[PDB]
Structure formats: structure tokens, C-alpha cells
A paper describes a structure:
The colE proteins are nonspecific DNases, which are produced by Escherichia coli to eliminate neighboring bacteria. To avoid autotoxicity, the producing cells co-express Im proteins, which tightly bind and inhibit colE’s activity. In the colE/Im system, comprising four homologous pairs (colEwt2/Imwt2, colEwt7/Imwt7, colEwt8/Imwt8, and colEwt9/Imwt9), each cognate pair forms an ultrahigh affinity complex (KD < 10−13 M), whereas the non-cognate pairs show non-protective affinities (KD > 10−10 M). Our results demonstrate that the design of substantially different backbone conformations, orientations, and sequences at the binding site generates dozens of new interaction pairs from a single starting one.
To verify the atomic accuracy of the design procedure, we determined the structures of two designed pairs by X-ray crystallography: colEdes3/Imdes3 with >3 orders of magnitude pairwise specificity relative to the wild-type colEwt2/Imwt2 and colEdes7/Imdes7 with low Im specificity. In both structures, the conserved hotspot region formed as predicted. For example, colEdes7/Imdes7 exhibited relatively high cognate affinity (51 nM), but Imdes7 bound three non-cognate colE proteins with similar or up to two orders of magnitude higher affinities. In the multispecific colEdes7/Imdes7, however, we noted a conformational change in loop I localized around Ala25, while the rest of the loop was atomically accurate (0.7 Å Cα rmsd on all Im side chains). Nevertheless, this local difference relative to the design conception prevented the formation of a designed hydrogen-bond network. Finally, backbone flexibility may disrupt the formation of the designed polar interactions, as seen in the crystal structure of colEdes7/Imdes7, enabling alternative binding modes and leading to multispecific molecular recognition as for Imdes7. By contrast, multispecific designs, such as Imdes6 and Imdes7, exhibited low Z-scores (1.4 and 1.5, respectively), including, in some cases, alternative backbone conformations of lower energy than the designed conformation. Imdes6, Imdes7, and Imdes8, by contrast, exhibit α1nM values <0.1 and are expected to bind multiple colE proteins at this concentration.
Numbering used by the authors:
A (entry chain B): 4 to 109, 112 to 130
B (entry chain A): 1 to 88
Write the structure that this text describes.
């Protein structure tokens, strides 16, 4: 399903100054509502394709960009996922990941359902 | 290349060049991940990749700041330091 193409849909959620503090929690972190507006109806070859445009939009949001230090800002500017804190990594999974809160319907592109998580939160892939 | 076995085979200047290569981030993503993995292997610092991506507020977010924290932490924990070069 992550390798299948499709159309971005949904609203996202309002987000403050400690956005990815939620990434390791039960909920994970939501797609910021304003980021959600910029991706709606775009078509994606696979979920890896959505991931790149998402982090690019995050880098262009000053309120989100400043929640990262210099090296992570350079990554998201290039569409790469930021490094997660070392304690929140799992082996070679060093970077924040995009996952789904609830079952995907017949989907993977529903931005009400997409969560940013730490590798550790999503340890059992 | 003369092979590195530990961080003590690096002069501080050589290690700063290595950290600047990482900070420059001109490599492929795969190469960048392998450079950070090697960085952690060499420093043995429990912060791991946090020295690069989640630096503490009380030093410079720069290769020089990273090398300074590694140098001070390793010395205080009775670990081997950098090779002395011809600056000494």
C-alpha cells in the first residue's frame, strides 16, 4: 500500500512550538493543518514521494523550521527527514518516519491519518 | 589511506575536517548516514548523532563546537585523546 500511487486528502491539526515532542507518544505528531493545505489533491507515485514534498513544506514554515537546529534544517530544506534524537532511533532507522494512526481504507495519503513518529514509536515494522 | 583504528589515530585538525565533511552534507544520503555511523563509532559519546543534530545550547552549533565537546567529554571520562600533530 505504501508503494501504491494515490491522491493526498484531509485537513491535519493545529500545531505549536514543540511539534515533534508528540512523535514518540501514543498519538505521534500530526500533519500541521497549514502544511496539509499545500499538499491536498497532489498525486504521488508512492509514499516515499509524499515524504519529500512534506519535509520541504516544513522547511518553508518559519515557526516549524526554527524547532530544528542547523543540521536538521539543512536536511528538511532538501526534503530529507530530520534525524530523530539518538534515544528514539532504532539501528539504521535514524530519522523521523511517516506512519498511519488508524487502518488505511480502500488511503495511505489521508493527512488526518498520517503521523510523524520516531523510529522507536514505530519499532515493530 | 593509512587506516584509522580509533579517534586517537586522528589529530584534532584531522577530526575537525571529518566533522566539517559531515556538516557540509555534500555527500549522498547513504554516504551521510555511513559518515554519522563512523562519527559515533569514533567519539564513543553517549549523545551519538545528537552532537550533530540536537546540540546543547551552551556551545557553538558548529564542527568546532562538536570537536570541543568530544575533546572535553573524552578527557573527563579517561578515554584516549587526539594524536598530537606538529602544532605541539
Amino acid at each position: 500500500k505504501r508503494n501504491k500511487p494515490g491522491k493526498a486528502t484531509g485537513k491535519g491539526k493545529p500545531v505549536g512550538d514543540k511539534w515533534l515532542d508528540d512523535a514518540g507518544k501514543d498519538s505521534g505528531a500530526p500533519i500541521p493543518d497549514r502544511i496539509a493545505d499545500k499538499l491536498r489533491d497532489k498525486e504521488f507515485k508512492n509514499f516515499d514521494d509524499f515524504r519529500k514534498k512534506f519535509w520541504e513544506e516544513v522547511s518553508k514554515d518559519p515557526d516549524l523550521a526554527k524547532q530544528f537546529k542547523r543540521s536538521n534544517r539543512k536536511r528538511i530544506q532538501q526534503g530529507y527527514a530530520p534525524f530523530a534524537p539518538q534515544k528514539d532511533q532504532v539501528g539504521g532507522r535514524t530519522t523521523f518516519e511517516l506512519h498511519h494512526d488508524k487502518p488505511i481504507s480502500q488511503g495511505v495519503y489521508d493527512m488526518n491519518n498520517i503521523r510523524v513518529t520516531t523510529p522507536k514509536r514505530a519499532i515493530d515494522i | 589511506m593509512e587506516l584509522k583504528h580509533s579517534i586517537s589515530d586522528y589529530t584534532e585538525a584531522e577530526f575537525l575536517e571529518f566533522v566539517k565533511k559531515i556538516e557540509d552534507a555534500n555527500s549522498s544520503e547513504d554516504e551521510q548516514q555511513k559518515l554519522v555511523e563512523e562519527f559515533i563509532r569514533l567519539t564513543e559519546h553517549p549523545s551519538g548523532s545528537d552532537l550533530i543534530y540536537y546540540p546543547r545550547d551552551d556551545r557553538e552549533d558548529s564542527p568546532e563546537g562538536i570537536v570541543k565537546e568530544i575533546k572535553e567529554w573524552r578527557a573527563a571520562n579517561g578515554k584516549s585523546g587526539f594524536k598530537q600533530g606538529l602544532e605541539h
